Every structure is written in C-alpha cells, then in structure tokens.
Amino acid sequence: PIPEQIKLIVDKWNPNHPNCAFKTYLYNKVDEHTVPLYGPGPNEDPKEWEEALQRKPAPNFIPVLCSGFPSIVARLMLQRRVITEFNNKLHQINASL
Amino acid sequence: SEALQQEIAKIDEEIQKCIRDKEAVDAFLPAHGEQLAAIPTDVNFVTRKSEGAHNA
Amino acid sequence: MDEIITRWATDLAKYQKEFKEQAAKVMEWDRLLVENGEKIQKLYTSTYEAERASNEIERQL
Amino acid sequence: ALFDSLLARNKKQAEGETALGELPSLQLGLADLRQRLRKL
Amino acid sequence: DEDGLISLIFNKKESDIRGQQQQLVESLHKVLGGHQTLTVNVEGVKTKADNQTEVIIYVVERSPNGTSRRVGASALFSYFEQAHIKANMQSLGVTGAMAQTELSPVQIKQLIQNPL
Amino acid sequence: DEDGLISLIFNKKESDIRGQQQQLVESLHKVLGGHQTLTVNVEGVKTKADNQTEVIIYVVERSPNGTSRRVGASALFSYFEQAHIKANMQSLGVTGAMAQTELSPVQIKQLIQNPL
Numbered sequence: 001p002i003p004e005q006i007k008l009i010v011d012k013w014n015p016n017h018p019n020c021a022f023k024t025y026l027y028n029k030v031d032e033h034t035v036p037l038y039g040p041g042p043n044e045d046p047k048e049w050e051e052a053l054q055r056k057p058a059p060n061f062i063p064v065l066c067s068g069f070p071s072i073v074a075r076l077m078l079q080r081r082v083i084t085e086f087n088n089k090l091h092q093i094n095a096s097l
Numbered sequence: 098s099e100a101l102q103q104e105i106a107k108i109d110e111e112i113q114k115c116i117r118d119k120e121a122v123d124a125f126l127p128a129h130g131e132q133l134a135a136i137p138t139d140v141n142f143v144t145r146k147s148e149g150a151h152n153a
Numbered sequence: 154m155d156e157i158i159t160r161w162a163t164d165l166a167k168y169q170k171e172f173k174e175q176a177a178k179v180m181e182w183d184r185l186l187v188e189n190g191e192k193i194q195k196l197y198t199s200t201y202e203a204e205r206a207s208n209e210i211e212r213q214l
Numbered sequence: 215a216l217f218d219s220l221l222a223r224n225k226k227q228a229e230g231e232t233a234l235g236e237l238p239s240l241q242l243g244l245a246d247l248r249q250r251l252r253k254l
Numbered sequence: 255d256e257d258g259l260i261s262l263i264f265n266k267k268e269s270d271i272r273g274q275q276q277q278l279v280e281s282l283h284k285v286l287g288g289h290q291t292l293t294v295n296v297e298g299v300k301t302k303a304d305n306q307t308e309v310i311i312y313v314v315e316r317s318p319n320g321t322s323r324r325v326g327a328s329a330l331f332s333y334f335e336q337a338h339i340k341a342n343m344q345s346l347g348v349t350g351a352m353a354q355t356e357l358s359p360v361q362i363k364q365l366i367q368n369p370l
Numbered sequence: 371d372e373d374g375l376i377s378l379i380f381n382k383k384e385s386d387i388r389g390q391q392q393q394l395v396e397s398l399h400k401v402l403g404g405h406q407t408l409t410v411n412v413e414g415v416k417t418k419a420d421n422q423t424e425v426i427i428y429v430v431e432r433s434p435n436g437t438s439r440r441v442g443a444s445a446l447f448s449y450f451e452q453a454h455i456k457a458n459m460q461s462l463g464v465t466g467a468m469a470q471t472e473l474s475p476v477q478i479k480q481l482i483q484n485p486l
Contacts (some may be wrong), residue, residue, distance in 0.1 A: 002158075006108075009161050013112050021169055024176040028367035029187060031360060057184075064367050066176060069118040074369020075179050076125055082186060082362035083132050086193065089356040090139055093196050096204060097146050105157065112164070119168055122175055133182050140189050140196065147199050149215030153223075183366065190359050321476010 015067050017043040022068040025052040026075060027061040038062045255355040258312035258324035259297055260331055262343075263350040268301040271309060275299075278346070282311065285342050286333070291316045292325075327353040371471040374428035374440035375413055376447055378459075379466040384417040387425060391415075394462070398427065401458050402449070407432045408441075443469040 012021040025048070030038065040049055044065065052063035066072055228238040242250060264271060271278060275296065282294045297310040313325040331353040333339055343351070357365070380387060387394060391412065398410045413426040429441040447469040449455055459467070473481070 005158060005162075009158075009165060010108060012165055013115050021165070022172050024173065024180075026176070026180055026183065026366075029359070029363045030367075062367070069115065069122050069172070071369070072172075072176055072179055073118065073122055073125070075183075075366055076122070076129060077369045078362070078366035079179070079182060079186065080129060080132070081365045082357060083129070083136070084352065085355075085357035085362055086136055086186070086190065087139070088354065089193055089197070090136075090143055092356065093193075093200050094143050094146070096200050097143070097150050109161075112161070116164075116168065119172065126175075126178075130182075133185060136189050137185065140192050144192065144196055144199075146215040147196060147203065149219045150203050151199070152216060153219045186362075187359075190362075194359075317474060317476050319474040319477035320480050321474055323476070 015070075017067060020067050022066075023048065024066050025063040026066050027052075027057060028064045029060060030062050031060055035060065035062065040065065255326045255328055255353075256324060257354070258327050258330060259354050260311055260327060260334065261352045261354075262309045262311065262348050263302065264307045264309060264347045265305060265349050266307055266347045267305055268299065268307045271299055271307045278309075281346055285339060285346075286313065327355045328357075371442045371444055371469075372440060373470070374443050374446060375470050376427055376443060376450065377468045377470075378425045378427065378464050379418065380423045380425060380463045381421060381465050382423055382463045383421055384415065384423045387415055387423045394425075397462055401455060401462075402429065443471045444473075 008019075011018040014020065017023075049063065066075065228241060230238055279294050279296060283292065286292050286294070293314045293316075295312050295314060297312055298308075299310075300308045302308050312327075313330055314322050315325050316322045331351065334343060334351055395410050395412060399408065402408050402410070409430045409432075411428050411430060413428055414424075415426075416424045418424050428443075429446055430438050431441050432438045447467065450459060450467055
C-alpha cells in the first residue's frame with residue numbers, strides 16, 4: 001500500500017483535480033441574463049458545481065473553482081484591482097460632495 | 098535507489114515549491130487586509146458627509 | 154522510509170487546514186466588498202440627486 | 215459632516231437678521247433646559 | 255479610461271528620472287514592442303520620496319488610416335501587469351503601477367472570477 | 371481597398387461606351403501617365419439612364435521585379451480627384467466617381483482636417 005499513498009499525495013498537491021484536496025468554490029456575482037452562461041470547463045464534477053449552486057448565498061451568483069494557491073492569489077489580485085476602483089469611485093463621490 | 102531517491106527529491110521539491118506559493122499567499126494578506134478594512138470605514142464616512150450636504 | 158510519508162501526510166493535512174482558512178477569509182472579504190459596493194452605488198445615486206438639487210437651487214437664485 | 219451642519223444651521227439661526235420677524239433666539243442648556251423641556 | 259493615464263512608481267530620484275528622460279521613454283517604448291505605431295508620452299513627473307518618483311504616462315496608437323488615439327488605461331495596465339512585462343518594467347526601476355479608471359462592479363466581478 | 375475598384379459615371383449612352391471601349395480604356399491609361407507599368411481594366415459596364423453609364427475600373431501596377439498588384443482604391447481615387455486630373459476626366463465625359471472602401475473614422479477625420 002506504499003506506492004498508492006505516494007501517488008495519492010502527488011495527486012493531492014496538483015491542479016489536475018484528482019481529489020485536489022484544495023477544493024473550495026468562490027461565488028462570483030454575475031447579473032442576469034448571463035446566468036445561463038458559465039458553464040465550467042475541463043475537470044469540473046457537476047456534483048461539486050451543483051452542490052455549490054445548491055447552497056447559494058443570493059441569486060445572480062455563479063460559483064468559481066479555486067484549486068490550490070495560485071487561484072487564491074489570483075482572487076486576491078482581483079480583490080486589489082477592485083479595491084482601487086472602490087477607493088477611486090468613493091473619492092469621486094467625496095469630491096462632488 | 099536512484100529512481101526512488103530522485104523521485105522523492107522531485108516530489109518533495111514540487112511540494113516545497115507549492116508551499117512557497119502558499120507562503121506567497123500568506124505574505125500578501127495583511128496589507129490587502131488593512132486596505133479592505135479601510136473601505137467600510139470610508140464609505141461609512143462619505144455616506145455621512147452626503148447626509149450633511151442633504152441636510153444642508 | 155515511513156518517516157517520510159508521515160512528514161508528507163502531516164504537512165499535507167497541516168497546510169490543507171490552513172488553505173481552507175485562507176480561502177474562507179478571502180470569501181468573507183469578497184462578501185464585505187460587494188456589501189460595501191451596494192452602498193457605494195447608493196452613495197452615487199444620493200450624490201447625483203444632491204447635485205441636481207443644488208443645480209436647481211442655483212437656478213432659483 | 216451632519217452634526218457639523220446641525221451646528222452650522224443652529225449657529226446661523228441664532229445670529230440675526232433683518233428678516234421681518236425671526237430674531238436670534240437665546241440658547242439655554244443643561245439646567246434650565248431640562249426644566250424647560252419638562253414644562254413642555 | 256480614454257485618457258489612458260498610467261502612473262508608475264520608480265525607485266529612482268527625480269533628478270535621475272528627468273536627467274535621462276529620453277532614455278526612459280524609449281525603454282518604455284521598447285517594452286511595448288518598439289513599433290512606430292506606438293508613442294509613449296510623459297504626462298507628469300513628481301517626487302514622492304528621496305529615492306521614489308512617480309511618472310505618469312499615456313501611449314498614443316496610430317491606425318493604418320493615419321488616425322491616432324490614446325490606448326485605453328485598462329488595456330495599457332493589463333499589458334504592463336502581464337508577468338513577463340512586469341518583470342521587464344521592474345528591471346527599469348518600476349516598483350508599482352496604477353490606472354485611474356474606476357472599474358464597474360461587473361468588471362471587478364469578472365477580474366475576481368478570472369484573476370489570470 | 372485592395373480590390374482597387376473605382377466606379378465612374380459617364381454622360382454617354384451604354385452603346386457608345388461599349389462601342390468605343392478600346393479607345394476609352396486607352397484614354398484612361400493616358401490620364402494615368404501612359405506608362406507600360408499601369409494597365410486599366412474594366413470590371414463592369416452598366417446603364418443608369420438614357421445618357422448615363424457607369425463604368426467600374428481597376429488599375430494593375432507592375433513592379434521592377436515583375437510582380438503585379440492592383441492600385442488601392444483610395445490611392446486611385448485620390449489621383450482622379452486631383453483638380454488637373456478631374457478636369458481631364460470630365461473631358462472624357464466623366465461626371466462622377468466613387469470608391470467602395472468604407473473609410474475609418476480616423477481617415478475621415480484626417481480628410482476633414484486637411485481637405486486639400
């Protein structure tokens with residue numbers, strides 16, 4: 001049972017999604033009528049996708065596949081990119097006031 | 098023992114290489130965290146100044 | 154050689170338990186972001202209204 | 215800036231002017247005011 | 255966004271930036287591919303600290319019909335943040351960058367859903 | 371634009387145009403300078419009214435290396451609209467001309483900024 005655990009660990013630490021063990025879904029908001037799009041891709045289990053859609057926080061949200069660390073880094077990247085936009089708009093409001 | 102001792106090296110190296118990314122996440126958090134926590138305090142402030150103008 | 158598999162599996166579970174937390178934290182942050190965003194939009198509306206009203210008062214005077 | 219505008223309004227309030235009726239009102243506060251409130 | 259302004263922070267003193275501005279502008283032109291259809295313009299230069307300088311740029315692109323317009327800020331920022339381009343920028347002393355366009359909620363949602 | 375097609379309106383009956391097509395084509399060749407590196411081709415002839423005929427042409431230009439290609443429509447139209455050339459064209463009975471290329475906004479802006 002040795003070369004199985006090894007392969008399973010090699011499988012765990014990987015973006016190929018053979019039970020990635022870094023499987024978390026993040027809900028990205030998308031206004032209608034774009035809900036019909038998305039639409040996962042290569043290695044998405046409809047089980048995980050539907051189970052994500054099942055416990056939905058609010059409508060017009062689509063789940064997003066975060067496999068491992070580069071994905072959560074990317075999510076952060078976006079979060080900053082929106083941070084700046086937020087601050088900017090807020091400052092606009094401030095200025096007009 | 099060569100293929101094995103090499104394979105373990107490559108594997109452990111890859112894992113360590115992944116943990117570097119994990120650490121990379123860990124590093125970029127607190128700053129971004131402050132930035133995020135800053136927002137609600139401002140919008141909760143600018144919303145107040147608006148109320149001032151409206152009352153004015 | 155088991156002493157290596159032990160390290161691998163321990164590290165795995167250890168860093169999994171942390172990755173879950175990070176992800177969760179990110180999610181919470183997203184919630185915060187949209188939750189505020191709605192309010193930002195409300196501020197946009199309220200502000201535009203104020204602007205129009207001020208312009209009207211300007212016209213009146 | 216809300217409370218600020220409340221002050222500012224209540225400041226400009228008790229300060230004139232020639233408006234054919236509305237003269238500045240004297241401010242009370244605390245001791246006299248509580249009783250003035252109770253006498254409502 | 256149409257004004258195309260990108261702010262860059264350099265880890266260099268203002269006098270050094272201004273003293274070699276021709277060279278700096280051409281290096282930025284090279285990072286963009288160096289074609290004669292793109293021209294880097296400096297909007298402003300401002301000291302931020304002893305060894306920190308902000309340089310605001312935009313890029314004018316010319317069409318095959320001779321028409322010119324500024325590259326949109328989001329498009330230009332997207333190019334500069336690509337990993338290969340960012341690395342080249344860092345070699346010129348760039349330590350940060352910012353666009354002025356306040357993104358819409360849907361744009362922000364798209365960036366978060368597809369951070370790459 | 372690469373198809374090089376220019377439509378010409380003639381104040382002549384179709385039968386007259388077709389009846390002397392060799393001569394008409396050579397006169398257009400002469401207007402272009404008459405060199406052996408340019409060849410006028412007729413793409414089509416269509417009656418438009420009793421004494422109005424549309425003639426669609428293109429011009430093939432040969433390079434010193436023996437290669438041939440069509441003169442671009444915009445380039446050919448630009449030549450024919452020059453005041454001296456237009457006058458020569460009018461002497462052949464041409465009362466109008468059109469290119470098919472839909473110009474870009476930047477091209478249109480350039481033409482308006484520099485109408486000459």
